[PDB]
Amino acid sequence: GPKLLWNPENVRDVADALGITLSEEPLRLLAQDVEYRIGQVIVESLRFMRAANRTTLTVQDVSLALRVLDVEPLY
């Protein structure tokens, strides 16, 4: 597979929190999916930042990005 920016150890810790044991293949797949979702969020946030004639990223832009993607808000 490709080279992953997201370390699978975070996924391993998340699995450990839920009492689950994972093989290598699903671990890699989950890491890749998380990486893709992070990329999508970053793209949306940068779109919202550029729409406002700015170069400084704020939490409001990230919240709007999360809203357009139908993700539960973070408070």
Partner 1 sequence: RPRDARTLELLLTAQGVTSFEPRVSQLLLDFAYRHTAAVLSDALHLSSITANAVALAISSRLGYQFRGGGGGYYGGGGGGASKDWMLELARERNKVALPRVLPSEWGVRLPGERFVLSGVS
Partner 2 sequence: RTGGIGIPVSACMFTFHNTLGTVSCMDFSNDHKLVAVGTMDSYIRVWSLDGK
Partner 3 sequence: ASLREFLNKMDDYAPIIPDAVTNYYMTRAGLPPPPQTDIRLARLLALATQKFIADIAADAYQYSRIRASLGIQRPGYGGGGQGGSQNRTVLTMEDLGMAVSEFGVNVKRSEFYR
Contact 39, 46 (CB under 8 A): no
Whichever of 19 and 55 has its CB closer to partner 3, that residue is 19
Contact 31, 61 (CB under 8 A): no
Look-up: residue for tokens 């946030």?
Answer: 45
**Shortest Cβ 11–partner 1 spacing (Å):** 6
Cα separation, 60 vs 44, whole angstroms: 12
**Shortest Cβ 32–partner 1 spacing (Å):** 10
Cα separation, 6 vs 58, whole angstroms: 23
Residues 31-60 that bind partner 2 (CB under 8 A): 51-54, 56, 60
The option from partner 2, partner 3, partner 1, none interacting with 3 (CB < 5 to 8 A, set by class) reads none
Where do contacts with partner 3 occur on this chain (CB under 8 A)?
Answer: 9-10, 13, 17-18, 72, 75
